[PDB]
Structures are given as C-alpha cells and as structure tokens.
C-alpha cells in the first residue's frame, strides 16, 4: 500500500463583506517506498478533510523513480518555478541528506541514501514540485542504452 | 656547468619580455610584461628589434642581463 505524510498545513483566508472566511490547505506526499511517489493538495475548513482530499489527489500523479541499489543513477537538479533541488547519488551507508519536504518525497520514493541541497525557494509546494521534476528526468542506463542503439557495456 | 636564464623580447629603449599570468581565481590568462635593462656592448641593437638576452652578474644599479643575439631586426 501507500504511506502518506502531511508536509504542510496552511490556514488561508478570503475576505468577504463580513470578516474573513478561513480554510485549510494540506500538502501531502504519498509513496510506497518502492519507487513510486506522488504529491497532492486539498482544501477544506477542517484539517483532516483537507488531508484526505490531498491524499486522494496525490494518487493520480504517481511517478516512477529509477534507482540503482537504493540510489539515483546520476546527479540532477530539479527546478519548478523558483524552487530548485540538487540531488546527488550517495553511498549505501549514507542516509537521506535532505532538508524539508525534499526528505518526505525522497523517503516515500524509497531512496534512503542521497545528497540533496535545496537551492532556491523554500516554499514547500514549489520545493516538492522541484523534487518531483528532478526525479522525473532521471534516466537509467538500460533506457539510454536502448535509445543510443548500443548495449549497456558500450556506454562505458 | 650550469644554465643561466634566457629570454626573448623586443627593445623598448636603446627589453620587454611580455609573458602570461594566469588568474588565480578565474583561470583566464592575462598578458603582462616586464622590462629587462640589458647590456648591449657596442650599442648594436635598436628600437623594435627582437633580441635574445642571458642573465649575468650585476652590471649596474639595474642591469642584470647581457644581449647575446639579435633575432628580428627593427
């Protein structure tokens, strides 16, 4: 099944002729820790109801993260708007060296070993979108060997 | 025996030995030049000639080189 983590709960307001009308925004990452991760958002006056909406929306945009023995195939920087996340493969002994919402995304993907630095906006939604962007652009050796028409050994 | 330093340059008064100093931080090569007051014996060379010089014992307050050979005439 899919584990989920509540990255951020934000109380937002819209102004009306009376006072202010408040709602709650939940940003949630879902993942199975086996190479499938996804994020979603939901909004409600109640915190738990916003979480469930965010969880449901996350399941519709799961991504396939290439991995090699628990680490990424190569360095990449994921960028979304002002968010930008540098991700680098690390040795199996190393843990997830990540700061905030990056850690939630990488852990629920099943990384356990990575060197990551958030170089940009620390706004959680855009940090999360940047992280997914970088994982969306990783390429495993078997895939790039197929496009170049060589075998995996000839790549090296 | 032993070798004395040799330079090639152009006469700027009757020797300029322009070299490159690579930038410590940025890695770009920057041209720099140093004037080598040299001993010409019988005033043989003239302005703009490209000459070869060799290091010697001090000959005056600032002369430490002797003009050995003229390479490209003015």
């Amino acid at each position: 099944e899919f584990e989920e983590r509540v990255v951020t709960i934000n109380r937002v307001a819209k102004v009306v002729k009376g006072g202010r009308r408040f709602r709650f925004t939940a940003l949630v990452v879902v993942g199975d820790k086996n190479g499938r991760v996804g994020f979603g958002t939901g909004k409600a006056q109640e915190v738990p109801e916003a979480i469930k909406k965010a969880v449901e929306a996350a399941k519709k945009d799961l991504v396939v993260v290439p991995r090699v023995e628990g680490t990424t195939p190569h360095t990449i920087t994921g960028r979304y708007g002002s968010g930008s996340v540098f991700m680098k493969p690390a040795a199996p002994g190393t843990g997830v060296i990540a700061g905030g919402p990056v850690r939630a995304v990488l852990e629920l993907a099943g990384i356990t070993d990575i060197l990551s630095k958030s170089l940009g906006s620390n706004t959680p939604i855009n940090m999360v979108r940047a992280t997914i962007d970088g994982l969306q652009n990783l390429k495993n050796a078997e895939d790039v060997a197929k496009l170049r028409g060589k075998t995996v050994e000839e790549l090296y | 025996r032993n070798d004395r330093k040799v330079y090639v340059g152009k006469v700027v008064s009757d020797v300029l030995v322009e070299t490159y100093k690579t930038h410590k931080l940025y890695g770009k090569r920057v041209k720099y030049s140093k004037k080598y007051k040299t001993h010409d014996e019988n005033n043989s060379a003239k302005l703009g000639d490209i000459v070869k010089i060799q290091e010697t014992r001090p000959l005056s307050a600032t002369k430490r080189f002797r003009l050995v050979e003229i390479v490209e005439e003015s």
């Binding site: 190569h74 493969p89 496009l147 | 770009k28």
Partner: protein, 131 residues
C-alpha cells in the same frame, strides 16, 4: 559577430532537437565534422552528410528520436569557451551524467570522447558535454 562556431553548432542541434526536426544544415569545418561523427558513433544522432560547395562546405545532420518520439539527445553544453578555455588531464577527465553522457575532448591524438581519453591516457581541451 560570430565568435564560437562550435557553440553555434551545439545550439543549432539544441534548437532543432527542441522542435523535433528531422534534420538540420550548418556550414562546415573540420572540428564540426569530427564532432558530428562522434555523435553518430556514440548513437546520439542518425547520420552525417558532407555537402561540398564553393564557400566552406555544408554539414547535414539527422536527428534521432526513440519510441513515443522521445529525444535521444537530452542536452548539449559548451564547456571550453573563447572567453575562458577549459583544459583537463587524463586523471581528472570529467564523467558526464555519471557515465550516461559523454564529454568531447580535443587531444593531441584528435577529437575523442572522455571514456576513450582515459583509455589512451591523454588530456586536452574539453569541448562540450553531451547527454
């Protein structure tokens, strides 16, 4: 005016690749011919043709796209530049994309890849990264 014909070639490829063109033409030079052949040999592009003319020659390149029209070339990047030339030794040859990409190096044994430069124990000018 034109200052880097090699970076102009790498950018012509990048722009044509962005819009998934089948082929592109550019004026020729010896190093651009040799860069193009290495891209063919490494499997990044399909074919290279040389068209003779009176001025300087023409290089015709044929781009490669996989199933579902996915681009074989992901990116090109000029490394050594007229404003700042980049050289490397065989012991410090850069790997591109953890080995999944290539670096084009101009060495005293010609223009070759980074994987071959370490094999031959030669360094030289890092022309570009292709991945």
């Amino acid at each position: 005016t034109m200052t880097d014909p090699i970076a102009d070639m790498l950018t012509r490829v990048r722009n044509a690749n962005m819009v998934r063109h089948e082929k592109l033409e550019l004026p020729a030079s010896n190093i651009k011919k040799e860069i193009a052949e290495i891209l063919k040999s490494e499997g990044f592009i399909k074919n290279v043709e040389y068209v003779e003319d009176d001025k300087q020659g023409v290089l015709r390149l044929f781009l490669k796209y996989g199933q579902n029209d996915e681009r074989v070339i992901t990116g090109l990047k000029r490394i050594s530049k007229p404003g700042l030339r980049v050289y490397a030794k065989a012991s410090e040859m850069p790997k591109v994309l953890n080995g999944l990409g290539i670096a084009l190096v101009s060495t005293s044994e010609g223009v070759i890849t980074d994987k071959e430069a370490r094999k031959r124990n030669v360094g030289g000018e890092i022309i570009a990264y292709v991945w």
